């Protein structure tokens, strides 16, 4: 090596070195050890470059332009040696990155300047191995450029883009090569439309060709399922690195083809990660893309339209940015309200359900930006949101919240007697409005809330429940995975200035082109509190606890108990009556002629977060006890509803005693 | 926990005292409950050496089981509990490997005395399974060497005289015991062997009878098991036997024959066991009917049973190995068989809707049938290599991990890609990184195997290293990179804590939300055996040389020890040079001018 360094330092013999490297000469040798007894053939240039690789790479990077020019001038008949030398130079430039900066970028630009010399490499009717070599070289160039000098226009973009598109469109490539291409996707994501929609077309063609309509056609353990999940995870990683609105559109279209996706957790985690990371403009662009997907008149079924909001848009909205939420709200104020106040059709069944779904989705969206936004914008003096059609910053108050709460109240107060076209969809529509109204109410005003019920044959309780589904409450809460993230790239994929061995493992992957995954200590890897909780309810298998409007209303009840109502510290706070909401719930629960599901709903409401229920005691002791001791209940035997009711009502002893009054003593004896 | 010895001694004394006063002894009671209780206590014992006292108390004087069953000789229709005693003994004998030999002779004497005057059934089968489990205790012939086999053979052959109404459940175990008389010690069973084999073959022929007569399916399974046991030790090679072994393979061949009635298997399992253990003994018997044999073994490999699955896999492996051996020996005239086998393998491999077991057998066939493929045509091995490498990249070098073994099959695939790499004139330059990643991941996944699978893994690594080093100087550099990367990955694992690891197996971890997998974290000491085996490769060298037929009979190719040692020292020096071991002080800071005194500098040291 020292003699080679001296020989190179003597003059400028770069041409001789490329020439002696790109030289066909076979050096016959005997069998290495004992293999066959015949001779072993190997090239002179390959051996010479294999031994003293570093010196040749260093002096070729010294005279970069001439070396690249000669190498790509002789790259028609020596494709093995040219690829080997180019890869060696790229690895050499990737090493010493923190000190020898701008050498790798210069090498990548110089290589990209002569793509027409490698045009005959990736073309049609070419060997597949040569195409994989072209893909690997292109990947190395893209990572070593770090998306600094390569972009649309002024970068010889058409040749590279045509190469990438032709690599994608080839039908002979296996799924792993297309997966490497999908890994290379984020470098081409700065599209400008027009002719660059061909990327979208070939991506959709790939999705149609290799992805099944249902995600259950491949049984677990089959190689087809593993390849499918690998391709999906590569697509999701490309989305995360990309933040492309097109990629989000494609993956949501794929995800919403079925109610349950085998890799739904990965989809939601990727959506929440791209919602957390980024800038304001990217977030509003992504939200606008999903919103325009949702509000488009296409022959798409109702559950797919519901899944566009419930699974995708909900996560992005909940993990969005504060100002992006405000801008999205200001964008979507006008259309949502006129949609909510719009009249119905009730003529064609295909038009009924889409209108119902659109109203339900708009209610959920407004629920989200009322739950996550402060009161200083929805209703205040300097409100950036201008709901009024006239606008011009005139008047003051709230012409938005009043109309929204009025529309929600009208949605609750719906008389469905004699109207039987679709019931469950509206059941959701009524529950959706209630939760939207609760989220609006929670952060606008204080004191006593809106009047409840009012009768006139329009009560929220009958509209929010099914009245026909018998809840199968078992003896106890019991008897109501997939593919996981798999291994990780720990101590690899990045130097991170933390470990040199990790840096060598990260260069092994760059050189070989295949990422390395070790074995993780624990199969589940919770990075943070993502999906664990939002910004005590450890029982999800119950139907009454997994109700659309049970979780919101209980949160509303807990909000009533804290920082609202009479000040704390009351001793024997009115043990002769109840407040309007409490006494309303008492009347609906204490009455024995109301359907069973309402009584079960209110009883489970009382059981959950029993702190608020315990004050005003010796009052709620009886309506729970009548339900506990009754022939009509959640089921036969001592089911867990009875167990919870009995535990709560016996833990209330001392403060309240079911004695003295003969009405409850008989029922207590019956219960015993 | 500690009082079990006193309790078991008290129970033994009570059992000894039970056979007094009234000879009824509570009829079926008052002994059965005691036997069941002592058996439950014995099987519910502890792990440490406390069991030595109770094992010595079990095999002891009058307050013992052996003296009890010896004195139970006059139990005419009395004390129907000796079978439970024998079952407990065989369970206990299975539970603990007999520590000392003077107890084994007493055990076999007691079971032989049980054999005498054994009325009807329900005790003969316990006695025979006790004897069967006893004969597997030594496995080295250093104990049980007084050689009473002559009297046992004479008695068993005397039992063959009746042959009228012996129970089927008894006859099968009797013939299994007759088969078990072999593989005990040499210079025995060499004079009566011919008569015994003639009687066994005639009895089996009468068992099938080749008619609509009663087949006696339990008897046939025991006959095949005894046949396999006899063929295990004695050669009986058909190469010198043209007539009496063609029928002994035909018997197996009709035993393999599937049917709708499962009949609790046994009879289609003993035949596959015999084939698997004795395929080398039917040369050309397998060849003359390869298509049917292959399809039937594949059909048995595609089933739902577990033991039958293992038997089918082993039988198919032995068949394929024999066929591969004969074709590699005579690849010139043997071309249609190779064409059929490799066409089936090609179809299975290219079938993208394949399973793991079918892919495994296809890859094994790829590995076995390489040399004949090379001699027929040079361009086939390249396609085999590229397809195998693509499949290995698809299945192993992936992040998916839905959940499976996915690591208990890598050595079986590495040994198969090693053969195709050995039989390649030129190597595609683009799959070398894939091969390097495969070998590095195989090295990393070492502490996830049983010891035998660990030895298989090191043998696979040795074979791949030989294939890599027998190709060219550049592939030696690939070997060097593989070794260096493996050393880096081993060194990057977390450091063993200097503090004591407390009591081993103290609990079952936190057991969170579905905490399974049992992925034990490796340490530096978990990889010690692998590199010792790498630097001591002579035994694996001769094992591979005996297994495969290749030009490797020379000490030059054997010198993988020097190569691997040099790579180890070079990697150690490289890691030492590249590592950054400088150290500084971080509790203090620079740019101090008139600030708080603790914030300027620590007291001088």
From Swiss-Prot, chain B:
Consequence the record notes for mutating residue 263 to N: In a lung adenocarcinoma sample; somatic mutation
Record PTM: Autophosphorylated at two clusters, the T2609 cluster and the S2056 cluster. Autophosphorylation induces a conformational change that leads to remodeling of the DNA-PK complex, requisite for efficient end processing and DNA repair. S-nitrosylated by GAPDH.
Family statement drawn from the similarity comment of this UniProt entry: Belongs to the PI3/PI4-kinase family.
Subunit note: DNA-PK is a heterotrimer of PRKDC and the Ku dimer (composed of XRCC6/Ku70 and XRCC5/Ku86). Formation of this complex may be promoted by interaction with ILF3. Component of the core long-range non-homologous end joining (NHEJ) complex (also named DNA-PK complex) composed of PRKDC, LIG4, XRCC4, XRCC6/Ku70, XRCC5/Ku86 and NHEJ1/XLF. Additional component of the NHEJ complex includes PAXX. Following autophosphorylation, PRKDC dissociates from DNA. Interacts with DNA-PKcs-interacting protein (KIP) with the region upstream the kinase domain.
Organism (species): Homo sapiens (Human)
Positions annotated as HEAT repeat: 288-323
Disease named in the record: Immunodeficiency 26 with or without neurologic abnormalities: A form of severe combined immunodeficiency characterized by reduced or absent T and B cells, recurrent candidiasis, and lower respiratory tract infections. Some patients show dysmorphic features, severe growth failure, microcephaly, seizures, and impaired neurological functions.
Name of this protein: DNA-dependent protein kinase catalytic subunit
Modified residues (N6-acetyllysine): 117
Domain of life: Eukaryota
Positions bearing Phosphoserine: 511
Record's signal peptide: none
Subcellular location(s) of the protein: Nucleus; Nucleus, Nucleolus; Cytoplasm, Cytosol
Residues of the full protein shown: 1 to 605 of 4128
Cited function: Serine/threonine-protein kinase that acts as a molecular sensor for DNA damage. Involved in DNA non-homologous end joining (NHEJ) required for double-strand break (DSB) repair and V(D)J recombination. Must be bound to DNA to express its catalytic properties. Promotes processing of hairpin DNA structures in V(D)J recombination by activation of the hairpin endonuclease artemis (DCLRE1C). Recruited by XRCC5 and XRCC6 to DNA ends and is required to (1) protect and align broken ends of DNA, thereby preventing their degradation, (2) and sequester the DSB for repair by NHEJ.
